[PDB]
Amino acid sequence: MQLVQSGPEVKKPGTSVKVSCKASGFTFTSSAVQWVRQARGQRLEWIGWIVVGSGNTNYAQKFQERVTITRDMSTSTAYMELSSLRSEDTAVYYCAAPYCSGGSCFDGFDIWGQGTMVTVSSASTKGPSVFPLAPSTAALGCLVKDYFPEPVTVSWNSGALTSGVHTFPAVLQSSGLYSLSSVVTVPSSSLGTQTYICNVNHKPSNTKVDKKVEP
Amino acid sequence: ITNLCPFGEVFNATRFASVYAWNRKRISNCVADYSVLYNSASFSTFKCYGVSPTKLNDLCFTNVYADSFVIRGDEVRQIAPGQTGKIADYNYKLPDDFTGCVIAWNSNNLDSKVGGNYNYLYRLFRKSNLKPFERDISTEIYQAGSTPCNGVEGFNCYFPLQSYGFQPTNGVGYQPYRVVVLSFELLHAPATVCGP
Amino acid sequence: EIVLTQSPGTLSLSPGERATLSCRASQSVSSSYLAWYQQKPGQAPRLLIYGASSRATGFPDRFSGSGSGTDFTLTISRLEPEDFAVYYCQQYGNSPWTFGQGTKVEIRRTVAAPSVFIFPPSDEQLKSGTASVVCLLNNFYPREAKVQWKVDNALQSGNSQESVTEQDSKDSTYSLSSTLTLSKADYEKHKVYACEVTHQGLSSPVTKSFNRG
Ligand SMILES: *[C@@H]1O[C@H](CO)[C@@H](O[C@@H]2O[C@H](CO)[C@@H](O[C@@H]3O[C@H](CO[C@H]4O[C@H](CO)[C@@H](O)[C@H](O)[C@@H]4O)[C@@H](O)[C@H](O[C@H]4O[C@H](CO)[C@@H](O)[C@H](O)[C@@H]4O)[C@@H]3O)[C@H](O)[C@H]2NC(C)=O)[C@H](O)[C@H]1NC(C)=O
């Protein structure tokens, strides 16, 4: 009943791409597979369905060209090549399938995955440019900007001090860079006391930036 | 003086049946010269479990059922006592404990040419796993969900058949291998096809 | 084919709802080739009712709705605050199998007033990345959110960056902050900044931060 997908791929502005959905826990011999699009704070656009028992496929009005599926019956997977990648295709592609076992099966597309993360940027995985938010009854936080699209997490020096941490999402910059923020509201009027930490990791370009915020 | 029933014309021809509408020619009252298929032959994979190939001409069964099939190169092995695969589960099936011979010879030429041939489609997506010796000459939209589509395709409702997309520039385990199954019978009836 | 545009927008009330959502259709679609997914923040969606004539295998109870072709209506009847996320209608049968606009849900909170505060860039900003000032308004419930400015001796809004969060399951609040990014190399034509937030419950704020330089 599980379905794993590959890691977040990174490409160049218009070369190619391919994604893999491994199907397990249900009979993949006679089933169907569909592929969709997603984004951050956006809608969903159906892309292309695969009768995977026997290959026959169509595509959406914007995806007739530059797209074609790949069967790969063995290993119980699924592929589709997207060509001439465009900048506005920073999408989680997902995949779905009906629970089919024996020849007759459920209508609703119930078996899903988790999707990948493709970012068609300049691909220069440059280190983040982060800076503290010096506090001015108030709040305090950290600033992260100007980094390649990457899964980034923020600690707070104790596995705690999560009393108002606000990790805002990632917004693209003009050149394809990424930025976000992490702000925590003050536990109390503790302006003249104690020290904080902006503990942040960065997994692909391994670094551990630690800035101690203080007025 | 004897004669020879038209056994070879089933074996050699341009257009051979299909995967699901498979021909089944009854042959009786003849001296079928079996010597031409084993003693002097150029047919690969002449393993025909059920009767020893030697002295085949000196033992004779009741009636002959000559078959005809076109299969991809790798999928020839599915002709067996059931086994697995898309043959003998939705396609023509081999009965359990059957007695008769099976031959499979490469046919990269002689009507296996460029372009996915219009005919030579699978037989797929049957609600049951078939019964032996019965022939499927019917087509209809499969059932794959709660509501039955009323004749218009769409979600699910798969068409059972897909064409073979082969050509004379394929690999080694995917080129066509024309298959002939000579089915005997064991019953309480006298043997008709007999002779040296 | 795509004029669905599910009638409800954002609705907000605690459990005690009789709320209903509608999936209007272009042409009356045959039933049982429908679906009604349920997206969640940061996860994959699910399936609730597979064709307006049943309910899916197993899912939380107390809501199941059905409708007609051009109006595939649905209902919810007093569901828990756990099920507050974006829905998505669906169609099968005719290619392309199109989805819908999607419906959003919210919770009543009786909106209050925040504390306003400004964040000046340190003296490192002469040699840092960008001379940006940071503000943050705290816990606005309403959808409306507007921020303006009047920076010291400059009239241009070429670059401005905003950051907003989704629902907070603990108290059902929205919180956004304003960090405007402008020219760094100058640090001489824009010193005493303005950063204001407007609401009826907040009236007219004041934000004239410490004189830079
Ligand atoms: C269906 O399609 C298949 C093709 O897959 C046909 O098979 C071919 O059939 C023909 C005719 O039956 C075969 O042609 C034969 O060629 C022989 C060539 O001579 C060789 O052998 C002699 C020694 O015997 C050597 O000296 C010589 O150098 C060659 O090496 C002919 O000699 C054969 O004639 C035989 O019959 C006559 C009449 O009885 C005798 O007088 C002869 O002496 C000789 O014994 C024969 O013509 C061909 O080889 C087959 N192809 C193969 C085996 O790959 C089927 O015939 C066709 N029809 C049916 C009904 O199945």
What is the C-alpha to C-alpha distance for residues A105 and B142, in angstroms, rounded to an integer? 12
Binding-site residues on chain A for chain C (CB distance < 8 A): 34, 43-46, 49, 58-61, 94, 106-110, 112-115, 129, 131-139, 141, 143, 145-146, 166, 168-169, 171, 179-181, 183, 185
Q: Is the dihedral of CA B92, A77, A59, A97 positive or negative?
A: positive
CA–centroid distance, A61 to ligand 1, in Å, is 60
Point out residues after which chain A has a gap (C–N over 2.5 Å). 136
Contacts of C127 (CB under 8 A, 6+ apart): none
Task: Note the residue count of chain A.
Answer: 215
Pairwise CB contact (< 8 Å): B154 & C94: yes
Q: Which residue has the tokens 């084993």?
A: B38
**Phi and psi of C88, rounded to 5°?**
-150, 115
d(CA A155, CA A210) in angstroms, rounded, equals 10
Residue of A151, A153, A133, A161 lying closest to A209 (CA atoms)? A153
Domain boundaries, chain A: 3-120, 129-213
> For C164, which DSSP code?
E
| The CA-based dihedral angle spanning residues A86, A88, A90, A96, taken in that order and rounded to the nearest 10 degrees | -90
Buried b (16+ CB within 10 A) or exposed e, C25-64: beeebbebbbbbbbbeeeebbbbbbbbbeeebeeeeeebb
- Are C35 and A109 in contact, with CB atoms under 8 Å apart? yes
Nearest to B31 by CA among B67, B57, B53: B57
Chain A interface disruption, residue of B158, B159, B163, most A CBs within 10 A: B158
- Resolution expressed in Å: 3.7
Rounded Cα distance, C36 and C63, in Å: 12
* Phi and psi angles of residue B37, each rounded to the nearest 5 degrees, phi first: -100, -15
Task: Yes or no: say if C72 and C23 are a contact pair by the CB < 8 Å rule.
Answer: yes
Tell me if domain A3-120 and domain A129-213 are identical in fold: yes
Question: Exposure of C184 by Cβ count < 10 A (0-12 exposed, 13-18 middle, 19+ buried)?
Answer: middle
- Look at residue B75 and give its three-state secondary structure: helix
Separation in Å, CA of C34 to nearest CA in chain B: 10
**Cα R_g (chain B), whole angstroms:** 18
Q: Quickly tell me which residue has 């669906």 as its tokens.
A: C90
The token pair that represents A19 in the structure block: 């994604």
Burial degree of C12 (CB within 10 A; 0-12, 13-18, 19+): middle
User: Cβ distance C105 to C61 under 8 Å?
Assistant: no
Inter-residue contact A97 to A31 (CB < 8 Å): yes
- Note whether C45 and C90 are within 8 A (CB): no
Tell whether B147 is within 8 A of chain C (Cβ): yes
Taking the centre of ligand 1 as the mean of its atom positions, its distance from the CA of residue C115, in whole angstroms, is 103
CA B7 to ligand 1: nearest atom:
60
Evaluate whether B48 touches B98 at the Cβ level (below 8 Å): no
Write the DSSP symbol of residue C123. G
Q: Minimal CA–CA distance to C162: which of A181, A41, A164, A130?
A: A181
Closest atom, ligand 1, to C-alpha of B42:
54
Q: Classify residue C154 as exposed, middle or buried by CB count within 10 Å of its CB (0-12, 13-18, 19+).
A: middle
Residue C10: φ, ψ to 5°: -115, 125
A64 contact partners, CB below 8 Å, separation of at least 6: none
Grouping H, G, I as helix, E, B as strand and the rest as coil, residue C22 is strand
Between chains, do C96 and A61 touch, taking CB under 8 Å as contact? yes
- Asked if the Cβ–Cβ distance from B145 to A103 is below 8 Å, we say no
> Where is chain B discontinuous (C–N over 2.5 Å), named by the preceding residue?
none
Torsions phi, psi of B38, nearest 5?
A: -125, -40
What 3-state class would DSSP assign to C27? Answer: coil
Chain C residues with beta carbon closer than 8 angstroms to that of B148: none
Contact C50/A181, CB-based, under 8 Å? no
Q: Which of B7, B9, B36 to mutate to test the pocket of ligand 1 (most atoms within 8 A of CB)?
A: B36
Residue A49 tokens read as 């369905």
- Spell out the residues 6+ positions from residue A134 whose beta carbon is closer than 8 angstroms to its own: A213, A214, A215, C119, C120, C121, C122
DSSP codes joined into one string, B105-167: EE-SSSS--SS--SS-B-----SS---TT-----------SSSPP-S---SS---S--B----
Q: Ligand 1 center to residue B34 CA distance, Å?
A: 15
Q: Which two tokens stand for residue A78?
A: 């699924």
B26-55: b (≥16 Cβ within 10 Å) or e: ebeebbbbbeebbeeeeeeeeebeeeeeee
Name the experimental technique: cryo-EM
Q: Which of A37, A107, A175 to mutate to test the interface with C (most CBs of C within 10 A)?
A: A107
Chain A residue with CA closest to B146: the answer is: A107
Which atom of ligand 1 is found nearest the CA of B6? Answer: 60
Q: Which of C39, C52, B144 is nearest to A99 (CA)?
A: B144
Ligand 1 pocket (Cβ < 6 Å) reads B 8, 11-12, 42
Q: Nearest by CB to C136, which of A94, A110, A139?
A: A139
From chain B, pick out residues whose CB is under 8 angstroms from the CB of A107: 145-147, 155-156
What is the spatial distance between Cα B59 and Cα B190, in angstroms, rounded to a whole number? Answer: 13
Cβ pair C109, C173 in contact under 8 A: yes
Report yes or no: B15 at the A interface, CB cutoff 8 Å.
no
- Write down the CATH number for the domain with range A129-213: 2.60.40.10
Query: Is residue C12 classed as helix, strand or coil in its secondary structure?
Result: strand
DSSP H/E element including C36: strand C34-38
Cβ pair C57:A110 closer than 8 A: yes
Two tokens, residue A79: 């592929």
CA contacts within 13 A on the Cβ side of A212: 2
Q: What is the 3-state secondary structure (H, E, C) of B7-45?
A: HHHHHCCCCCCCCCCCCCEEECCCCCCCHHHHCCCCCCC
The Cβ-side half-sphere exposure at A28, using a 13 Å CA radius, reads 19
B33 Rama sector, left if φ>0, alpha if ψ -120 to 50, beta otherwise = beta
Hey, what are A65's tokens?
A: 């060209």
* Strands B177-183 and B69-71, sheet pairing: antiparallel
With 0-12 CB in 10 A as exposed, 13-18 as middle and 19+ as buried, what is A163?
exposed
B120: left (phi over 0), alpha (psi -120 to 50) or beta: left
Angle A19-A21-A26 (CA atoms, 0-180°, nearest 5)? 165
C171 Cβ contact partners less than 8 Å away, ≥ 6 residues apart? C109, C139
CB within 8 Å of B143: residues ≥ 6 apart: A104, B127, B157
Q: Are A120 and A11 in contact (CB under 8 A)?
A: yes
Q: Specify the CATH number for A3-120; select among 3.90.660.10, 2.60.40.790, 1.10.3080.10, 2.60.40.10.
A: 2.60.40.10
Q: Which residue has the tokens 């964040």?
A: C119
> Is-contact C180 C160, C-beta < 8 A?
yes
Cβ distance A100 to A31 under 8 Å? Answer: yes
Peptide bond into C96 cis (omega under 30): yes
Q: Which of A46, A137, A180 sits opposite C98 (nearest CB)?
A: A46
The CATH number given to C10-106 is: 2.60.40.10
Among B2, B5, B10, B12, the mutation site with the greatest number of ligand 1 atoms within 8 A of its Cβ is: B12
Place of tokens 């009239």: C155
DSSP string, chain A: --EEE----EE-TTS--B--EEE-SS--SS-EEEEEE--SS---EEEEEEETTTTEE---TTTSSSEEEE--TGGG--EEEE-S--TT-------EE--B-SS-B-SS--EE------EES----PPPEEEEE-----EEEEEEEEE-S----B--SSS---SS-EEEEEEE-TTS-EEEEEEEE-SSS-TTS------EEETTTTEEE------
| DSSP secondary structure letter of residue C118 | E
Contact A55, A71 (CB under 8 A): yes
Q: B74, B84 in Cβ contact below 8 A?
A: no
Closest by Cα among A85, A82, A33, A88 to A56: A33
What span, in angstroms and rounded, lies between the C-alpha atoms of A48 and A62?
11
Would you call C129 and A145 a contact, using CB atoms and an 8 Å cutoff?
yes
Candidates C35, C88, C164; nearest CB to A168: C164
- In the numeric block, which tokens belong to residue B31? 């001296």
Distance CA B64, CA B66 (A): 6
How many angstroms separate the CA atoms of A213 and A156, rounded? 11
What is the total residue count of chain C? 213
DSSP letter, residue C196: E
Distance from CA of B59 to the nearest CA of C (A): 59
How far, in Å, CA of A194 to CA of B2, rounded? 113
From the centroid of its chain, how far is CA B118?
Answer: 19
**Cα–Cα distance measured from residue B28 to residue B8, given in angstroms and rounded to the nearest whole number:** 14
Chain B residue closest in CA terms to C97: B155
Beta carbons within 8 Å of B64's beta carbon, 6+ residues apart: B7, B25, B26, B27, B28, B32, B182, B183, B184, B193
Bridging pattern class, strands C10-12 and C104-106: parallel
Query: What does the longest C-alpha to C-alpha distance in chain C come to?
Result: 70
